[PDB]
Design a protein around this motif. Structure first.
Motif, PDB file in Angstrom:
ATOM      1  N   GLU A   1     -18.742  25.842 -43.950  1.00 21.70           N
ATOM      2  CA  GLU A   1     -19.052  25.394 -42.601  1.00 21.70           C
ATOM      3  C   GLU A   1     -17.987  24.467 -42.021  1.00 21.70           C
ATOM      4  O   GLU A   1     -18.296  23.672 -41.127  1.00 21.70           O
ATOM      5  N   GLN A   2     -16.747  24.564 -42.505  1.00 21.23           N
ATOM      6  CA  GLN A   2     -15.619  23.726 -42.087  1.00 21.23           C
ATOM      7  C   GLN A   2     -15.966  22.260 -41.799  1.00 21.23           C
ATOM      8  O   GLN A   2     -15.458  21.684 -40.827  1.00 21.23           O
ATOM      9  N   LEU A   3     -16.808  21.641 -42.641  1.00 19.66           N
ATOM     10  CA  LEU A   3     -17.118  20.221 -42.473  1.00 19.66           C
ATOM     11  C   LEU A   3     -15.894  19.368 -42.751  1.00 19.66           C
ATOM     12  O   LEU A   3     -15.564  18.461 -41.978  1.00 19.66           O
ATOM     13  N   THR A   4     -15.235  19.622 -43.876  1.00 17.25           N
ATOM     14  CA  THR A   4     -13.953  19.028 -44.200  1.00 17.25           C
ATOM     15  C   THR A   4     -12.873  19.999 -43.755  1.00 17.25           C
ATOM     16  O   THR A   4     -12.894  21.171 -44.138  1.00 17.25           O
ATOM     17  N   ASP A   5     -11.959  19.513 -42.917  1.00 19.74           N
ATOM     18  CA  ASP A   5     -10.852  20.330 -42.440  1.00 19.74           C
ATOM     19  C   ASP A   5     -10.050  20.910 -43.600  1.00 19.74           C
ATOM     20  O   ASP A   5      -9.673  22.086 -43.581  1.00 19.74           O
ATOM     21  N   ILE A   6      -9.810  20.116 -44.637  1.00 22.60           N
ATOM     22  CA  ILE A   6      -9.108  20.582 -45.829  1.00 22.60           C
ATOM     23  C   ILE A   6      -9.929  20.227 -47.066  1.00 22.60           C
ATOM     24  O   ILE A   6      -9.765  19.124 -47.605  1.00 22.60           O
TER      25      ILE A   6
END
Lengths: 536, 536
Positions: free
Chosen positions: A370-375
């Motif tokens: 869910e792209q919570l952390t960009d990386i």
């Protein structure tokens, strides 16, 4: 049955004091140019009067040979959750363990102890490809009579010229409070700065291309002298002034050392993303918390603070041209119950620094999904789950995992450890991060330890031996450890794969399935390295 | 190849951590009535996760069994001048050594580590002769299941009944500054006293039957807190009042503890018999030397002191019925050249305390031959010479001699050590003196030590590992040690030979020729004890 024994060993097996003497009078090495390669000169006195032994090289001036003595450290127990096959030193441990490297060429030889010298050769780019040979001379004394032994080392220099590593980043969270404890310095005094420079230098020469910045002190424990490089003043209630001079001096120094990438401190305290960061102000000579120790991360005090800090961080980043080469952190290893807490912070970040891109240790896939952390930076135990979801990522290990997994513990066999760079390469990691470069002190307490006699920051077995640090405090900076040397040679093997056009899908890398299932034999390392450096 | 291994070993072989697991499920012991016997319960975990293990006895009430944990200490090197054939734990050392005994019955079992409990049995004189069997119960946990094992022990107790040792005296120079330094007490405070009483009780329970009185502080080094049990005041210059209240309290405590004989601090400082002892008085809160520390032994200052102290000493000795039960020392370990100075001092002694008989540690035979000392104490190395001369004498060791000679060091095999009492007996020693019962601090310096990590008072190889102490400092008193127990059982063997009337000239002891040539086998001890306890 000889008064004194010397032999040569690969830099990939350990030499325990009990181990019987070898013979091995010659040694063959492979090296790319623009590289550094390593080996061991081992010795065992069979006499019962103590003597002296000194190790020199001859005929290797152009190789720039650096000679160090392998010192020993106590190891009380094996680490937990490691089967015996996966453990270095079966039959020799628990006991003394070779790890620190000391800058001495002449030591005392003790009766029926097996010790080693560690030589590093710098293979320069401007070297004819072919076999270059030199000699190592061991001088000792029997009674009053001096003796020597000449041993023969040949290096197969390859046509291959190593090119700087690219599109792969390594970061360690070097500790400034660790320096201030083990050396009894005021934080950021001139000796502190000298040691910090020597550390960042040691890092980048071992493959670490990201300079960490502890703008905020990273620990839940409140210190009287915390490592907070951001100067923060409070001239009125709630109005903050920020002084960037320390961080500026750090960044200038790190750039002069070679750093281009930089990493910042978290913005919410670890485990739960529920608490604000501890931020201190200088009150006379002390450092006092700007707010409460329990201050919530969603409290108006911390929100006000952030509405002041984040734009000023932006100003600084732009003014100094850091913004594109800066990784930023939110809060570590968020558990699968404060996801919304993380998400709250994320959205607050989005509303207060929309420009900011976030990197965080995240081992549950339904976070990167869910792209919570960009990386996202999963622990290697979750690398495979991230690789089926095809979410590009970093990897980290700390303490866990163990057994068949990769680590760099005291009892991790060095060939298994040398496999790191190969695994980073073949499994297409974007980067590696580790918390334990020089965590030299007592876990979670403002109290110095003794790395030379405690290898788990006083927290075994929960913290594994060798996990908190790979360097040892020495009078002027770090003392390298055998593990640090082997790890940097491993990152150099990543560089080899890169600069030889070997693809991750090359069949010669095929058996490297996960970070748990891969060849541990030094024979594999040797033969694979051969193929690569011969065809080149 | 089971998750957990437990076996039974004698008290005569060490158990190193790497040591492979054994099977021995029963164990035959042999003892005499009114004795103490010992054995070992060993376990190696074969699990990667930590577990707990608890040792208990079942059916040994009448034997008042003591169950203790064998702790480990570091051992950086082997001792010098010890051939392999004379070293204990080859191929397991340097490394962790079993030595301290801890008052715990339950500990952590660590992976792939071989540890053991030490069990002391009290065999009472009343006990019926024959075969008495009891059991050991080992209770550990595997995962979540409770596991346990019964081990069988048969004691073959002889008709022979031990009579208290006659005509042989053991003294160790226990240090009260050692107590002061390690426990950070003020000298002669109530804690210092409680600990001293603990040490004296320990010594006498280990067959030490001479209470040492440090009436003068023995060290050539000037401490700011000396251990000078005699109180000394100087109301006018060079007139000395003495206060014996502390020596009174010490002697009372020792006699309440069973002590009959007593020994006194030297009168001239060591090496050359040339300098006066350091004697101190109080100055408010500090201690001051009474005179120069360069003070000559034949100076007027010192002789004027002795003319006052010696008659005063004599009064004290009469008042407490010590005179006949007291050993006196002149000057320790004088060399061969120094006999001159010793003669001078000796005659001074004769003219100022003609009543005083002095013993001293004197390796050259000219000391005994010429009766320069009333009781010479040659180093065991020199024993044979005094025997060739049939000069009566004590024996001592310290640091040296080493190699095949008897000693009590860390790497001294235990069978070799257990021979101690046998060699005392067959070689007709008057007594035994050892310098290092609890030298717990830095050699010659007023700085604490750490006996748990250092074993040579920071003086390896000069001081050998294990020479300065056989007991460790626990929180309420000493902690025993493996070497201590074996040595007490050696003195117990002296008592056995004496009690069954085995004459030194009995053939079974013919193998015991010198303190350097004698059987070092555990079979020899076992079979000879068999013979003696079956004749009875």
């Amino acid at each position: 049955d000889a008064p004194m024994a010397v032999w040569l060993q690969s830099s990939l097996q350990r030499i325990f004091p009990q181990s019987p003497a070898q013979t091995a009078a010659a040694l063959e090495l492979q090296a790319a140019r623009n590289s550094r390669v390593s080996f061991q000169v081992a010795f065992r006195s069979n006499m019962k009067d103590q003597t002296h032994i000194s190790c020199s090289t001859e005929g290797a001036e152009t190789l720039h040979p650096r000679v160090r003595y392998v010192g020993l450290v106590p190891m009380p127990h094996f680490n937990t959750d490691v089967s015996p096959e996966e453990l270095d030193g079966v039959g020799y441990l628990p006991g003394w363990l070779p790890d620190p490297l000391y800058p001495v060429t002449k030591t005392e030889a003790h009766p029926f102890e097996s010790r080693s010298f560690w030589i590093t050769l710098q293979i320069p780019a401007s070297l004819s490809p072919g076999i270059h040979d030199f000699h190592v001379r061991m001088r000792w004394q029997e009674g009053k009579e001096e003796k020597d032994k000449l041993l023969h080392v040949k290096v197969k220099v390859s046509a291959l010229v190593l090119q700087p590593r690219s599109n792969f980043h390594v970061t360690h969270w070097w500790r400034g409070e660790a320096i201030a404890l083990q050396y009894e310095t005021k934080m950021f005094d001139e000796q502190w700065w000298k040691l910090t420079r020597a550390c960042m230098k040691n890092l980048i020469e071992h493959g670490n291309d990201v300079a960490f910045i502890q703008n905020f002190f990273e620990l839940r424990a409140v210190f009287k002298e915390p490592c907070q490089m951001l100067i923060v003043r409070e001239p009125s209630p709630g109005k903050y002034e920020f002084d960037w001079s320390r961080i500026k001096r750090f960044v200038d120094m790190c750039r002069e050392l070679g750093y281009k990438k930089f990493e910042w401190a978290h913005l919410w305290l670890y485990w739960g993303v529920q608490d604000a960061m501890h931020v201190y102000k200088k009150e006379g000579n002390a450092y006092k918390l700007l707010w409460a120790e329990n201050l919530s991360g969603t409290s108006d005090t911390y929100i006000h603070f952030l509405k002041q800090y984040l734009p000023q961080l932006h100003r600084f980043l732009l003014k100094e041209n850091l913004l594109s080469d800066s990784y930023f952190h939110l809060s570590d290893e968020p558990w699968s119950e404060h996801v919304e807490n993380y998400k709250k912070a994320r959205n607050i970040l989005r509303q207060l620094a929309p420009w900011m891109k976030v990197m965080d240790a995240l081992s549950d896939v339904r976070y990167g999904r869910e792209q919570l952390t960009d990386i996202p930076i999963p622990i290697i135990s979750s690398d495979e789950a991230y690789r089926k979801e095809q979410i590009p990522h970093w990897v980290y290990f700390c303490t866990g995992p163990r057994n068949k997994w990769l680590n760099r513990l005291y009892d991790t066999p060095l060939p298994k450890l040398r496999m790191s760079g190969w695994l980073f390469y073949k499994l297409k990691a974007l980067g590696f991060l580790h918390w334990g470069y020089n965590f030299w002190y007592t876990l979670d307490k403002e109290q110095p330890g003794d790395p030379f006699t405690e290898g788990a920051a006083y927290a075994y077995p929960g913290i594994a031996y060798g996990d908190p640090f790979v360097v040892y405090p020495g009078p002027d900076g770090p003392y390298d450890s055998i593990r640090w040397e082997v790890f940097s040679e491993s990152l150099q093997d990543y560089a080899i794969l890169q600069s030889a056009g070997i693809q991750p899908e090359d069949p010669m890398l095929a058996a490297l399935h996960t970070y748990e299932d891969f060849p541990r034999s030094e024979q594999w390392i040797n033969e694979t390295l051969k193929k690569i450096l011969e065809k080149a």
